DNA sequence: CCCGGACCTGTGACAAATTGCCCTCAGACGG
DNA sequence: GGCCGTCTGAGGGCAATTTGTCACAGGTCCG
């Protein structure tokens, strides 16, 4: 079916901020890297538009603003910073734009691996439940169930959530239980979680899922 | 004992940013 | 050959929802 993402687990747990739409793009760049040093890609409205169900204009839209606010972030393996983008975007031609990668990202891409159908996350709207969704297909066995325990401090410090979900009934209402609802709502998978404490802190989040066909 | 204080939880308000939509008009191409 | 009819996509916008921030109500234990 559907194009088949796989990426170096550590990019799943790289500290960073993007946006959905710029988490999008970066999906097919991984994809046109691994199929084959050079860094340069490519991407076409007109195909952007049919993957994503959205019109060539708003596609249009979502391309070209994406495209500059790349401008500045940055990337840390833990800790090492990266930038994304070495030159800005253009495009030399009509519903086609071209795109200069750090050559020095590349052996972060292709390795310990995390795999994943495009499919399955095209849907999701927030970006910090895709950084969720990813990271559990990361302790995924092939029968399509799963189990792992986050730190809360890892979870604030490498997905870079703003600074009042520091103040946990925020992290509860505003990221933890509406992350927790788009996945049961727009993926096959169906996920349960529990909160470990000591004391008075809540200090891990335990999370079990199965997925649908079974 | 009960105080003020340092922790924790949940909800009500308001501000700022993102969503899918809508309209204009010229570029690229072929009949 | 060259104009025009169509398919694209590069711009300009919108209101309704969602995300980020902080005040206040209401629980416990410490000294
Ligand atoms: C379905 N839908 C989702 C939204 N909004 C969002 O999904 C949305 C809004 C935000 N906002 C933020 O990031 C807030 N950030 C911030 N205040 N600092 C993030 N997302 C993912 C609006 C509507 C909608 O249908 N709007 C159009 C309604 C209409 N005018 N007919
Ligand atoms: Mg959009
Ligand atoms: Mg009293
Ligand atoms: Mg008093
Ligand atoms: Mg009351
Ligand atoms: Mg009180």
């Known amino acids: 079916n559907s194009p088949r993402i796989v990426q170096s687990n550590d990019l799943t747990e790289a500290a960073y901020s993007l946006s959905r739409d710029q988490k999008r793009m970066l999906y097919l760049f991984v994809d046109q890297i691994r199929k084959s040093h050079d860094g340069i890609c490519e991407i076409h409205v007109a195909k952007y538009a049919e993957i994503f169900g959205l019109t060539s204009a708003e596609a249009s839209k ?12 940055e990337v840390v393996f833990y800790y090492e910073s990266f930038p994304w983008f070495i030159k800005p975007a253009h495009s030399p031609s009509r519903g086609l734009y071209s795109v200069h990668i750090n050559p020095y990202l590349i052996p972060f891409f292709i390795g310990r691996f995390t795999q994943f159908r495009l499919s399955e996350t095209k849907e999701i709207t927030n970006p910090y439940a895709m950084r969720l969704y990813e990271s559990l297909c990361q302790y995924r066995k092939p029968d399509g169930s799963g189990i792992v325990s986050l730190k809360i401090d890892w979870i604030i410090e490498r997905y870079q959530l703003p600074q009042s979900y520091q103040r946990m009934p925020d992290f509860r209402r505003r990221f933890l239980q509406v992350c927790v609802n788009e ?23 335990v999370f079990s899922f199965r997925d649908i066909t079974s």
């Open 183 to 205: 996945i049961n709502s727009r993926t096959p998978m169906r996920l349960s979680y529990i909160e470990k404490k000591k004391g008075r802190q809540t200090t891990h989040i």
């Open 62 to 73: 979502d391309i070209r603003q994406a495209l500059k606010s790349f401008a500045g972030k």
